[PDB]
Symmetry: D2
Subunit: 169 residues, 4 copies
């Protein structure tokens, strides 16, 4: 404990990058002709979700589910049916990617038209499970990050920018 939080990725940059992802995702699914649904993973992705779905220019539905994070359980499942639909799993950050990996499996069992993942942050150096991530906002080093849905000691989860925690001696 005993620390400080400084801006790592300012709000404007995050907003800009999200607008971009928005375009990319739209370009990618605009001609599918099938129902689409963005699936966020609570709690972490509520903010990134809120902002990302507004940038996606294709009629979709927004849903959430929460998984345990040694077995991976479903604490809260989807309300929507994804069978035959294009599904985009939306996450705040991917590091080890175990949980994500299993959630993807579980969902595919429901036979969606397609399955992809879009994360705001990516820590490639911390991967433990090879998992296909189709959209990334920022590839970052293994930094102690907070904000945009990411918390630390039940704090900072509501910050509008990605911050770096500095552990004072």
């Amino acid at each position: 404990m005993k620390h400080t939080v400084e801006v790592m990725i300012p709000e404007a940059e995050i907003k800009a990058r999200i607008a971009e992802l928005g375009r990319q995702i739209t370009e990618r699914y605009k001609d599918s002709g099938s129902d689409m649904v963005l699936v966020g993973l609570l709690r972490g992705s509520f903010m990134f979700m809120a902002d990302l779905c507004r940038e996606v220019q294709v009629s979709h539905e927004v849903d959430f589910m929460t998984a345990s994070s040694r077995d991976l359980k479903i604490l809260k499942d989807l309300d929507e049916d994804i069978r035959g639909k294009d599904v985009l799993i939306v996450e705040d950050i991917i590091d080890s990617g175990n949980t994500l990996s299993k959630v993807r499996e579980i969902l595919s069992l429901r036979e969606p038209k397609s399955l992809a993942i879009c994360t705001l942050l990516d820590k490639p150096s911390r991967r433990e499970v090879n998992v296909p991530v189709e959209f990334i906002g920022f590839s970052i080093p293994d930094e102690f990050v907070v904000g945009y849905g990411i918390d630390y000691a039940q704090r900072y989860r509501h910050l509008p920018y990605i911050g770096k925690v500095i552990l004072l001696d």
Copy 2:
């Protein structure tokens, strides 16, 4: 709605048959040496579970989970099943779609083994080929209630399998 309920499978037969299944399951897992866990599907299997686990002579844990076109997990397991022998316990299997998917979901967790044990089985109503390792009774497609199976929120607590008789 206007109906009657008559005994189809009396309580004694059910108890006897369960004692048997009990032996079968015990014989089958007694030498595994791995942790075991019976997983019941709520609400339907609470009674069959309660009785079946008492007949299983191997140290196991008892857990439940409840499932919902897409098949969802309304309540998940509390236990981890990875590397453990898992026996899904159900009151009755007919179409077997839900069961089928629940089995898939669980296998993703990599248990040592996966099996299903149902009290009742209506083979004539299957829609999904699903492996059922233990069966108490194979029955015709009858309107059944009791032992966890209800009808209009009734009979779920009957100690025997009953047949519903619609009245015209």
Copy 3:
């Protein structure tokens, strides 16, 4: 760890006592004329529930819900509506009775015709919250008990009798 389990309350005695409770509960609600529902608290009461409902001679519905056991949360709620109905909360054992206490409050908010609790075992000496328990199978001293839904180290939960754990030196 390192222990033994010996019979404290044999299966026959438990069966007999439950048949009795069965009669008592029936006598008590037989003339209500309102829908009835026994609500069990998972995991512990699945066995006591299974046996008790078979002794209750009044048409009822059986349901479950699971609560966290410092705030008391609802991990799994009822499927049935209890408003205007006679509700009997069914538990394997009551000791401190905090959780039970709160679950009772939560449910009353739904305005059931009536609310009662029926427990197999009762450890009066361990109460921390004064809570009304209308039916009791056995009042026991604060013994290390297992069986009939009560476990210890994920074991014995399936025993058909109440056992006493003996911690070998």
Copy 4:
């Protein structure tokens, strides 16, 4: 089903108004000295939540829970609210029955304080007198979509409040 959607409350107005609510809520709790937590009700409030919490200038935690004649808890809080200031965050309040009960349930947990903040309010549709401490917009009983509010699984992601126009 055959319809159109036109802008009722443009995105800019909503952002502005939220910044204001932000100030109000901050002014109100800045000196509490107790832990604070905004509790959103899924699905509807995920967007309003996301934007509102960024305007609240006091260290808080963000949590959600989802509720269902009887009002049930489909998903409960992860946080404990006892002794903490709790702000229930909703997209819109009309009849307010569900909200009303959720408030009761939570108070049973003895939080330091309990308040509600809704983006939209349809006073004309109230059925249960429930205290709403913060409101973004008081609107007539219009067919609204956007900002978390959907219609036929659509528009939930619109950045503005829209009005649905049925076509005959």
